[PDB]
Amino acid sequence: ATIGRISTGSKSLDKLLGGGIETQAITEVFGEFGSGKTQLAHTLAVMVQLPPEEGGLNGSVIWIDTENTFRPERIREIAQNRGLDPDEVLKHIYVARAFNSNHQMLLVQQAEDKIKELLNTDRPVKLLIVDSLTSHFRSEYIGRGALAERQQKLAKHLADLHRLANLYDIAVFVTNQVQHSATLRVYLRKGKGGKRIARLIDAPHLPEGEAVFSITEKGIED
Task: Using the rule CB under 6 A, give the single segment among 36-44, 80-88, 89-97, 99-107 that binds ligand ATP.
Answer: 36-44
User: Is 135 an interacting residue with respect to ligand ATP (CB under 6 A)?
Assistant: no
Task: Using the rule CB under 6 A, give the single segment among 28-36, 83-91, 143-151, 156-164 that binds ligand ATP.
Answer: 28-36
CB neighbourhood size of 140 (10 A): 14
User: Is 134 an interacting residue with respect to ligand ATP (CB under 6 A)?
Assistant: no
Measured distance CA(21)–CA(44) in Å, rounded: 9
Task: Rule CB under 5 A: choose which of 8, 10, 24, 38 binds Mg ion.
Answer: 38
Task: Using the rule CB under 5 A, give the single segment among 38-46, 75-83, 85-93, 192-200 that binds Mg ion.
Answer: 38-46
Minimal distance in Å, beta carbon 122 to Mg ion?
31
38 marked as part of a ligand binding site: yes
- Which residues are at the interface with Mg ion (CB under 5 A)? 37-38, 69
* Binding-site positions for ATP: 31-38
- Which residues are at the interface with ligand ATP (CB under 6 A)? 31, 33-39, 177, 215-216
